[PDB]
Task: structure prediction
Amino acid sequence: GAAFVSKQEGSEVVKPDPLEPRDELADHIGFQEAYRRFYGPV
Amino acid sequence: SRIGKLLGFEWTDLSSWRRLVTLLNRPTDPASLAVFRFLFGFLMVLDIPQERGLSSLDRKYLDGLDVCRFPLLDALRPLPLDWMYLVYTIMFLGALGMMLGLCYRISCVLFLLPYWYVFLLDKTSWNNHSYLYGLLAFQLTFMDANHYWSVDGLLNAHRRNAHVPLWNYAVLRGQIFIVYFIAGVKKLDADWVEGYSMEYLSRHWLFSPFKLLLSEELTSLLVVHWGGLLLDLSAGFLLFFDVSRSIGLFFVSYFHCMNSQLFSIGMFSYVMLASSPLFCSPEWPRKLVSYCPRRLQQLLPLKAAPQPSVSCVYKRSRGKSGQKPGLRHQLGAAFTLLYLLEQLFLPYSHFLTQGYNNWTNGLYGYSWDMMVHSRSHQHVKITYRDGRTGELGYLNPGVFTQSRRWKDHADMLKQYATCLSRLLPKYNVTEPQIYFDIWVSINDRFQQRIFDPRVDIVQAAWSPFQRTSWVQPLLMDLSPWRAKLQEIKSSLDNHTEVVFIADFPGLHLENFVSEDLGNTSIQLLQGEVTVELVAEQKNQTLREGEKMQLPAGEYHKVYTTSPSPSCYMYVYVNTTELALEQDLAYLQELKEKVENGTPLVQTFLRRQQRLQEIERRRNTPFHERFFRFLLRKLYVFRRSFLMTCISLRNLILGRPSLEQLAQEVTYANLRPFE
Ligand SMILES: CCCCCCCC/C=C/CCCCCCCC(=O)OC[C@H](COP(=O)(O)OCCN)OC(=O)CCCCCCC/C=C/CCCCCCCC
Ligand SMILES: CCCCCCCC/C=C\CCCCCCCC(=O)OC[C@H](COP(=O)(O)OCCN)OC(=O)CCCCCCC/C=C/CCCCCCCC
Ligand SMILES: CCCCCCCC/C=C\CCCCCCCC(=O)OC[C@H](COP(=O)(O)OCCN)OC(=O)CCCCCCC/C=C/CCCCCCCC
Ligand SMILES: CC(C)CCC[C@@H](C)[C@H]1CC[C@H]2[C@@H]3CC=C4C[C@@H](OC(=O)CCC(=O)O)CC[C@]4(C)[C@H]3CC[C@]12C
Ligand SMILES: C/C(=C\Cc1c(C)c(O)c2ccccc2c1O)CCC[C@H](C)CCC[C@H](C)CCCC(C)C
Ligand SMILES: *[C@@H]1O[C@H](CO)[C@@H](O[C@@H]2O[C@H](CO)[C@@H](O)[C@H](O)[C@H]2NC(C)=O)[C@H](O)[C@H]1NC(C)=O
Ligand SMILES: *[C@@H]1O[C@H](CO)[C@@H](O[C@@H]2O[C@H](CO)[C@@H](O)[C@H](O)[C@H]2NC(C)=O)[C@H](O)[C@H]1NC(C)=O
Ligand SMILES: CC(C)CCC[C@@H](C)[C@H]1CC[C@H]2[C@@H]3CC=C4C[C@@H](O)CC[C@]4(C)[C@H]3CC[C@]12C
Ligand SMILES: *[C@@H]1O[C@H](CO)[C@@H](O)[C@H](O)[C@H]1NC(C)=O
Result:
């Protein structure tokens, strides 16, 4: 579901990066269920 | 003995092992070393909650998350979240003890061990300044930095004002010189010399003084690139010699002050500023506290002759002929020599570990190649094949990853593929077969594939000491096209955009054209390609110089049929945005005319109104922004402290209940002053 895309959306080609400079960690898959299982209804 | 004053020693001191050992253990004033220790400990204390990730620990290391990690060794695994908080607490205590000089050696080890464990836990967080912090901690572990300006001298006065061996300063100066010189030598690369690495940096307002006498391109080339290279190559030589120390000090101070504002590198610039005074006399703080007014000279510790110590040997013509070099002295000299040799060798040892050699040599973090390469990723496609049925499927790029660095390295890609093969059975996929399709551009250049898209990475062979077979070579024979590419880019309107692509022979590219791009076309520049329309099943061949229009909301395929790589480009214009803008502009003029006589306009005008409030911020005094900055820092510090307290109480006592944890976490996110 949230881990899969369509063939149409995967083929859209038309849609810089330095590795010396050092935050969507909460947008991990299934993050909220685990966070509420560990910390309660926060 | 002009040499004796130029380098501080003679050529006869380096003729025999005993003479070298005697020279490298000469007593010295430990004041400068103590001041550097204090500053480094303070900076590390302030850096732990921000850059190391203490304030995001509960997000990164949640106990029940599905995540792929990238450690250097696959046998290394993280601990439960509570034990991770304990590790960070021990690291913080070690950093504080290092800063204060209290229980110096134990505090040094307590900082060093968890720090290196955390560093080795994740390869995607490696950079040059974290590696430098680790090296500095390792170096300071073996030094006598608590002989001055410390609380071990307010508790036992026998380690007070005691001398240190010579190699204590020699190793640190060698480390700084090595960093500077190897960075300069790495910047002897064609991309840096020609001015491709940092071509947008000169547009910053901090460079405005230089633009009074020079153009924009000359400012970009002469100042940012050539000036930086010259400074890197000459900083160590200027700082070492006494005649040119002040000028080099001014240059490095300006360089680091400017870099602290141009980039976001954490605390590296301040560490470099604090390390620069290690080249001065070892007694400079004594002179500094002497130069202060006499009204502030009765509260500081009394300035007396430093007492002798056993860590350094004393050689005199009258006070005894000499002493045999003990084990400690030879151990120190050997450590200095071997450590400097290893530090020289390591950035140039890429010819042994060939399994980490991509387009760029080795893993990033320990070669002092800062800001030389820049990457741009255009498209990533991941496709699996079900091993039980045979269906083809497509994954979201980076479902279980917490970073994006895996797109550039074969070892990280192999780790990620193994992760996916393990994790996909939980999502109803049996024995996955995974292929990757990644297009990257480095310092401009045409976009091209970095890996082979026909290879199943799960069974692909990787070895630390073997060259990887499925890594595509970089097409370095098309670099002289960059000027023409820039000309083509600038020769366009402000509504049309271009994408440049180079493809290897034998490979094709399947592309879905979106429905929002009604006016899109492809033009060939080199080689020869065959373009296929999937709906109509039509093959048409393009020769160098001719173009073709492509349909929208359809599929098409580009086959490379030449024996050599072929280059083409995509030209497109987003039609929907055109109509949207040209109706919003008409509506605004209609509003003006109605004055003289829509949710989209609402959103756009709100966004520009808050941007005009940002213009007010520009007019707003800098003290308001400073207050906001201080408040944000205070928030992150308070949150980290409260989370650590919660986890430590859970460890020591036990988890109370879900509701109590919810209340505590709600309190921890209170945003004190907003
Ligand atoms: C001649 C051998 C190299 C020594 C340095 C040459 C200087 C010329 C250009 C180099 C610039 C700085 C080099 C890096 C700094 C480390 C050396 C250092 O700090 O030495 C200074 C210090 C004297 O300092 P002060 O009395 O304050 O006098 C300061 C002068 N106003 O001198 C010493 O401690 C003697 C050091 C003996 C050599 C040990 C260091 C060099 C080791 C070489 C690294 C490679 C490892 C082994 C090499 C194998 C092959 C030889
Ligand atoms: C109520 C609190 C209770 C305790 C109070 C004690 C703390 C208050 C006094 C100390 C003040 C410092 C602590 C709080 C500072 C918070 C600000 C902070 O650290 O921000 C980091 C900030 C960078 O900000 P970023 O977020 O990267 O930029 C924005 C883009 N992201 O870093 C800094 O500004 C560093 C400031 C510390 C500098 C001090 C050290 C400088 C040393 C250089 C001296 C040079 C020569 C030295 C000579 C001697 C050498 C041997
Ligand atoms: C050991 C801590 C050193 C800290 C590193 C700081 C910078 C040092 C510069 C080197 C950086 C990387 C080179 C290291 C070479 C050794 C790597 C290694 O053994 O592990 C790699 C590899 C794991 O591969 P992944 O990609 O995780 O798995 C893919 C499938 N999921 O491990 C293995 O293949 C198993 C063990 C391999 C052989 C074991 C080592 C035997 C030979 C010893 C020499 C190697 C290390 C020498 C250290 C050099 C001194 C700095
Ligand atoms: C009455 C109730 C609401 C108590 C709430 C008090 C909080 C606002 C306190 C409790 C813990 C305190 C923190 C405990 C520890 C530190 C470490 C301290 O670390 C340093 O950087 C000081 C040393 C240095 O300058 O290197 C900075 C203040 C801070 C964040 C404190 C800020 C204020 C906090 C969050
Ligand atoms: C992009 C640049 C450097 C990358 C870099 C950085 C960021 C560092 O932190 C380094 C620290 C130690 C060793 C190497 C480092 C490094 O490689 C400099 C390019 C911009 C720079 C600000 C231009 C400097 C102006 C030159 C030096 C002449 C100006 C002199 C006036 C006073 C006249
Ligand atoms: C599709 O877009 C291209 C590029 O934006 C258009 O080509 C431009 O046409 C105008 C004529 O009005 C010329 O002045 C420009 O020089 C052309 N630019 C390029 C790069 O060729 C093209 O007209 C558009 N097609 C349609 C149907 O609107
Ligand atoms: C259009 O031409 C391409 C080649 O330029 C054809 O692609 C080949 O198709 C065959 C048949 O499946 C494959 O075996 C080849 O591997 C493909 N590539 C090449 C380079 O030969 C494509 O089939 C043609 N389309 C039509 C409709 O004829
Ligand atoms: C068991 C956990 C907690 C701590 C593990 C500590 C070990 C693995 C750490 C402690 C000090 C570290 C060393 C410190 C300095 C250097 C020199 C550098 O040029 C290469 C890496 C190297 C050689 C480090 C490798 C990792 C190391 C040996
Ligand atoms: C074109 O613009 C619309 C909104 O104006 C946007 O939703 C769409 O994604 C754009 N097209 C592409 C290919 O991104």
